[model samples]
Structure formats: structure tokens, C-alpha cells
Target: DLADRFAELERRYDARLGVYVPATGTTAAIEYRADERFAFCSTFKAPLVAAVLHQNPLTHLDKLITYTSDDIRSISPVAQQHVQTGMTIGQLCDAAIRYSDGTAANLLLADLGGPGGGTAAFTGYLRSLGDTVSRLDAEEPELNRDPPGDERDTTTPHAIALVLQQLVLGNALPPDKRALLTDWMARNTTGAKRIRAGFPADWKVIDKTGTGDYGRANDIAVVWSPTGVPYVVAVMSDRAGGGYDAEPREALLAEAATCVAGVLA
Candidate 1:
């Protein structure tokens, strides 16, 4: 049954496929030419949210976070005039992580005291957890603005598998921080019908989808099995599309990922 869906999924793009089940953390249950560079999209932003919040786990989620006129220039929620930038710190984390709100993410990065160490934070956090993946880097651009510049970030599939291992074991964050983040991931709004499409709808699945320009398209998510079982999957691909249309890229990745999940589920 799964093989059939898997075959149909491949027909959509005829690119590559790699599917990881909750039971096998280090292996792919289904894959064909598994590796082909794709866009990093928003998936890379996941760790950024974790990095910003771990450094400052203050309670009360909706308290406005401070941001300058330039800082608010990001796609993050802090840039949103409608949201009370003064929301509780917890709210910032929730909005950024659970919702993958760009404005809130940039804002929280500001709260952490600016973006120099954005990518380094993940490297440092992984070190703290005793994991290694030489190619892992956030998709933040090198330019002075959002995405920074032309310096696109990247990491390998196997490396992402390792990151998922740490997260599954609660090593990605402090005990309390893990609890808080996990709770929000359960309700993430981005994956709605895309990546989670294959699941039974009620199954607790945590995932982040990302895509931009020509960098990488990915869906890094954790799925909880029927019996409260946990599994991590990082499906990174390089979709043919390019440029600033992050939302469409997001939807595309979600669909591809869901097809994989339909089989795994």
C-alpha cells in the first residue's frame, strides 16, 4: 500500500525521495537517488527559533519585544505593526516557532542581541548535545538584509537526521524549554494540510517547511506514532523554483513531504 503512494508521489516531480519512519531514526524506509541539492527554505529557520528562545526563556509569552525601525525591517513578526511588539516573550517564541512567523523570528533574534551568531548558535547547541554534522548551516543569507546576502546555508540529509535525534531525546533544549517548544510544535500552523496531509489529522506531528530563491526546499519535522511513539524526518530538496516566494515554496514542499508521510503513516 505504501509503495503505491510512494510511487505516485515520485511521479509528481520525478525528483528524489527519502522517507524516514519513527522507528528508524538513522535510516530511510523509502528512497531513490535520495540526495539531490534543493532549497533550504523555511525549514532552516526552526533551529533559529530554538536558538533565540533557549538563550532567554523568560515566561509570559505576549510581552512586546523591543525592535528598532531597521530591525523591524525583517520579514519576522517584530516587523508587524498589528502585533503588539510588546507581546510576552513566550508569545514571541510561540508565534515564531509554532507559526513560523518571520517577523516574530527576526524580533526574537533581536531580543537575543542581534544576529551575528545566528548560525553559530545551532553549531554550539549541537556541540552541547554531542552531535556532529559537518554540513549543517542555517539558510540565512550573507547580505546585510534579511537572508543577509548570496551566501546560502546548507547541511546534508544524514546531518539533519542527527539533529532530529537530539531533538527527539530532549537534548535540543533544556528540560523546561523542550516542554514549551514541543507543546507549540504540536500545533504548528504551517504544515496544516501539506506535510501532515498523510497523517490521520489528529496524530501529533511537528514539522517546519522552508523554501526560497534557488537555495533549498525542506520539511524537517517530528511525527508521533499511534502509541505516542516519536520519530524525526528531515526531507531536504532543491526545488526548481527560485526567488522570494517563500509561501508557495512552503506549500510545494508540504505536498511532497505529505506524500512521503502518507506512506510512512
Candidate 2:
């Protein structure tokens, strides 16, 4: 039955759209182009959030992190024209995760040691968890674009889905920090037009959306059945030329959500 369902979606989507849904007991799952890697876009922030929380204690969230010239670049409308030039680390996470704010995200990266130190630590934590595909090397603005065919700061659908699963199931962060991370993602407003658009009233979806050059659209999410079982889904696609379109990709994610909903229902 799951095969038929995925086969249907594969025929319709045309472009490579990855989807993975694990069955009970971790014995089997639905997978369609799920291992192929693509630029992670803002989805990289999800891991960044995890790494930050894991490496730093909860109290660090309130500490002020000044934004210098390097961190002052225009990235997000919400953070670009703030009354003050700096904010607490928690505030930065809020702007970055909830609004997909680039300035805030890069500021967080700078705090983590700019490119080399931060990226090494971030990917180190991920690799420790068996996510071998994520290479989060660049800061926000540069992170949004990758070298031609380069998987820089990229992740496979399966890899990110597993990361979400580990973040939820493993002791990566204390319960409270995990709460902090999921809260931001669940409350994210930037992705309302994508993965959240197709869901019915009762299903709960906590998701983060990604947009990249060449029409790349990505979303990694935790979708819960009405009865409260959670499933992770990651869908990513790219078109020739840098023409990013959310409407069609949004519809595809909607359809993917519907397929999962049907199985669970």
C-alpha cells in the first residue's frame, strides 16, 4: 500500500522529490529519492540551533551577542532595522528560526567561531549522530548559494529527517533546550505557504522551509498524526536556472502531507 502511494507521488512530481516515512519498530519505511543530497538552504539552521544548544548551556540564551560590521549585513527585514544593534542569543534564534532571518543566523555562526571553528563543531556533532551528508561550512548569505553542483551546506532528505528524529529521540539537548528549539520551529510563520498549507485542521505540523538558487525548494518537518504519533518528512527539489517557485513546490509538499495523513488515518 505504501509503495503504491509513493509510486503515485513519484509519477506526479516529475522532479526528484525525496520522501521517507518509517514504519513501526524501525523495520521498514517509505523512501523515494530520499538519499540524494541537495543544498540545505535555511534548513541548515535547524542543526545549527541544535549544535548551539548542545554546546552552550541554557543560561547562555540570555547573554547579549553584539552584531558587528561583519554581522550587520542586510538579511532579514525583521532584524535589519531593529532599534538596537544587538540582542540576546535567544532573540537571535527566534529571528533566525521563526522568520528565517539571515542576519541573525550569521550572527549565531560568528559567535560559534565564524566559518572554520563553527562549521567544524556543527558538522562534528552531526557526524557523531550518523548524519554523514551534512556539510555546513558557510555563513548565512553565502550558505544560501552553493558552488556549481556543490553540496556545500547540503543534506539529503534522509539525513535531515534522521537528524530531526535524533533531536527528538536522542539526548542531544536537555529537555528544556529541546523545547526551545521545537517551539521556534513549530511557531515558524515563514513556511505557512509551503508544508503547512495542505494540512487538515486536526493534524499538527512543525516545519522549517528552505529556498535556494536555481529554483530549489526544501522543507524538513515533524508531522503528527491526529492521535499524536510524530513522523519526519523532508522534501527538496531544484529546477534549471535560478528561478525559485514556492507555489508548485508548496503543492507538492501538501500532497506529500496528504499521502501521510491518509496512511495514518
TM-score of each: 0.71, 0.87
Q: Which window of ten consecutive residues has the lowest lDDT sum in model 1?
A: 139-148
Question: Mind giving the per-residue lDDT tens digits that candidate 1 earns over 152-201?
Answer: 35444545555666664566777777776667766677676556764666
- CA error at residue 28 for candidate 1, angstroms: 6.6
Tens-digit lDDT string for candidate 2 (1-265): 6557656765676544667765556336667777877788888777777877887898888888766555655468567756466888888888878888888777777666665587677777789778878888777777776753777787888888889887865677789999988898999877776667656767788888887665677788877767777777676766534344422355666777676666656
Residue 19 CA error for candidate 2 (Å)?
Answer: 1.4
lDDT of 2 at 107: 71
For model 2 the TM-score comes to: 0.87
Best by lDDT, which number? 2
Error of 1 at 83 (Å): 7.7
Clashing pairs in 2: 214-242
